[PDB]
Amino acid sequence: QREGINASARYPKNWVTTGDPAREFTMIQSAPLMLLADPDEFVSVQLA
Amino acid sequence: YGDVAIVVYSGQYVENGVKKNFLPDNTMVLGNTQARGLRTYGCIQDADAQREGINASARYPKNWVTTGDPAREFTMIQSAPLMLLADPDEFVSVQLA
Amino acid sequence: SSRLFRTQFRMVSPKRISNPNNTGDSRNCRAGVQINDSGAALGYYVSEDGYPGW
Amino acid sequence: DPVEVDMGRSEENNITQSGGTEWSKRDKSTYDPTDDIEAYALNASGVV
Amino acid sequence: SKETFTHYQPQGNSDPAHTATAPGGLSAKAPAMTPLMLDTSSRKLVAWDGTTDGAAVGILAVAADQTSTTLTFYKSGTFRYEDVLWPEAASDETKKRTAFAGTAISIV
Amino acid sequence: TSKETFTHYQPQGNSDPAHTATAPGGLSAKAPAMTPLMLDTSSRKLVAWDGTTDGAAVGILAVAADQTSTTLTFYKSGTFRYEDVLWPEAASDETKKRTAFAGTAISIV
Amino acid sequence: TSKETFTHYQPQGNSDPAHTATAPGGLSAKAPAMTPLMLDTSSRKLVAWDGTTDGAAVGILAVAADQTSTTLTFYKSGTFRYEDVLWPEAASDETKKRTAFAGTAISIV
Amino acid sequence: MALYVSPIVSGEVIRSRGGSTSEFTPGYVKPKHEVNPQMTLRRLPDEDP
């Protein structure tokens, strides 16, 4: 939000925490909300 | 003393609250100056150091400051000393009395 | 081969030059620029068109 | 974790002055150290 | 003709020391770095007695008194064993060390 | 022939920090590293957690110690994985083991 | 700390040649390498030398085998050292176990 | 050295010389420290008044 890159595909961020057991972590932020505006276009048939 | 070199050592170090000489009262060491030792240092177990690859190092300064409301920074040093020797028999130790 | 000179020059907006996937910069790679031991630039990570941002 | 480093020093190399004739009971005027120097240096695996 | 300047170091470890505010039923003048428990019945705040086992809930940060309805106290971190004042009731060092067991407060 | 499976060792389960603190402890026997601990209701020292008394579990030890180890170091904060803990066999209930550290900065996932 | 050391395995003592022979085996236990073996008095099979029967040991096994092994290969000639070959603890006399393989092409040095 | 190999008997084969190995692996030390900038309020024993 500070960087202004809120809207994107993927947000990788790698950083190391402070303190004596200083260890590094990686984050992969995303918010996929894939949709289809023509639901009735597709027809699914369960065969039997 | 002819062929052997004579020295007198008096170095001290400070333990928890007091000082003391490195050597006990009366020690005598037959040694050779040409004997080879090892100042070996292990890999710095530090993720931050490994971020830029300083695995094998003599020393490792490091500084950081805590976040949040309390603000206070630190000084950090890391090393893995393994002072070693080539041959053990080339040195002879005698406790005088 | 329809032209005598096959070379073409394209200017590129700086916003198209950055670290790929916005990865964190390292000692040698900074903002998508490859830096050697001597500080000379080596390579550039360029993105394609960003319009629409879709 | 308490760890150890035993180089493999022979028991001869760490001989103390245990006994009734170490250095103090000896006569300060007549007794010499050179014999002790030789008797402790000959078993040193090389020149010292 | 000698006034030593000791290095004032209340902190004892790298862990952060966060603060918190809470109403306090203090009945005296409490200096800083004062252990305190939560009242058993009224749930007010008083200085730790040194007799109740593990009742202490934190370390006071800024000195106050009875008049202070609310008070600010440390909630996390580690402090030295010496700089922190102790109630005179507490005698053995073992329970003093283990006083803040199970909490974000520790001492060395 | 001999198939050995190397596995990385991450006791941590969450990004939360894991601060360690020292305290005296009346340990009985050789306690392996990262062992649950409790506080003795009488001796006021630290011993291996029984796995039976509720809420008595105070923390998780840091370095393996023994009865001769006067001072013991142990984590105060952080989240740890259930499978990567050497619990006492007395704690035979999974949910009790899970929520034993509830109420303090030590938690389980 | 651990002094694993390195010694060159030299089971053969002297330059006398070593020969092998394959015979049916009637072992009752898992037999490691360098095991003395005698002939069974009943079924003329091969059984690891118990150490109490004198001179009845016939061969010295080369490659470790077990009960399920129908037949096995044993050394039939040569000179071998003393510490190199695993021996039964029933035999105790030093000279007797030295001369255990006397009268054959197997020698102890 | 050469003790008594007689030229009527083959003799014996002298075992080779084998070495020994040791490990002294671990190694470590870390002297952390602190500054607590709140200390800076008071005057140092240096820095004359």
UniProtKB/Swiss-Prot annotation, chain A:
It is found in: Virion; Host cytoplasm. It comes from the Viruses. Belongs to the lambda phage major capsid protein family. Assembles to form an icosahedral capsid with a T=7 symmetry. The icosahedral capsid is about 60 nm in diameter and composed of 415 major capsid proteins. The assembly is primed by the interaction between capsid assembly protease and portal dodecamer, and major capsid proteins assemble cooperatively to form the procapsid with the help of capsid scaffolding protein. Major capsid protein forms hexons and pentons of the icosahedron. Viral genomic DNA is packaged into the procapsid through the portal vertex. Homomultimer. Interacts with FI protein. This is Major capsid protein. It comes from Escherichia phage lambda (Bacteriophage lambda). The lineage of its organism: Viruses, Duplodnaviria, Heunggongvirae, Uroviricota, Caudoviricetes. The chain holds residues 294 to 341 of 341 of the full protein.
UniProtKB/Swiss-Prot annotation, chain E:
The gene is D. GO terms for biological process: viral DNA genome packaging. It comes from the Viruses. Residues 1-26 are annotated as: Disordered. It holds the Pfam family HDPD. Homotrimer. Interacts with major capsid protein. Stabilizes the expansion of the capsid head shell after genome packaging. The packaging of viral genome in the procapsid triggers a dramatic reconfiguration of the capsid shell, expanding from roughly 50nm to 60nm while the capsid thickness decreases. 415 capsid decoration protein molecules cooperatively bind the expanded capsid, thereby stabilizing the mature capsid shell. Residues 1-16 have a biased composition (Polar residues). GO terms for cellular component: host cell cytoplasm; viral capsid, decoration. Belongs to the lambda phage gpD family. It is found in: Virion; Host cytoplasm. Keywords: Capsid decoration protein, Capsid protein, Host cytoplasm, Late protein, Viral capsid assembly, Viral release from host cell, Virion. This is Capsid decoration protein.
From Swiss-Prot, chains F, G:
It comes from the Viruses. InterPro entries: Head_decoration_D, Head_decoration_D_sf. Residues 1-27 are annotated as: Disordered. Residues 1-17 have a biased composition (Polar residues). It is found in: Virion; Host cytoplasm. The keyword Transmembrane does not apply. Its main location: virion. GO terms for biological process: viral DNA genome packaging. GO terms for cellular component: host cell cytoplasm; viral capsid, decoration. Keywords: Capsid decoration protein, Capsid protein, Host cytoplasm, Late protein, Viral capsid assembly, Viral release from host cell, Virion. Pfam families: HDPD. The keyword DNA-binding does not apply. Belongs to the lambda phage gpD family. Stabilizes the expansion of the capsid head shell after genome packaging. The packaging of viral genome in the procapsid triggers a dramatic reconfiguration of the capsid shell, expanding from roughly 50nm to 60nm while the capsid thickness decreases. 415 capsid decoration protein molecules cooperatively bind the expanded capsid, thereby stabilizing the mature capsid shell. Homotrimer. Interacts with major capsid protein. This is Capsid decoration protein.
From Swiss-Prot, chain H:
The gene is E. The lineage of its organism: Viruses, Duplodnaviria, Heunggongvirae, Uroviricota, Caudoviricetes. Belongs to the lambda phage major capsid protein family. It is found in: Virion; Host cytoplasm. The chain holds residues 50 to 98 of 341 of the full protein. Assembles to form an icosahedral capsid with a T=7 symmetry. The icosahedral capsid is about 60 nm in diameter and composed of 415 major capsid proteins. The assembly is primed by the interaction between capsid assembly protease and portal dodecamer, and major capsid proteins assemble cooperatively to form the procapsid with the help of capsid scaffolding protein. Major capsid protein forms hexons and pentons of the icosahedron. Viral genomic DNA is packaged into the procapsid through the portal vertex. Homomultimer. Interacts with FI protein. This is Major capsid protein.
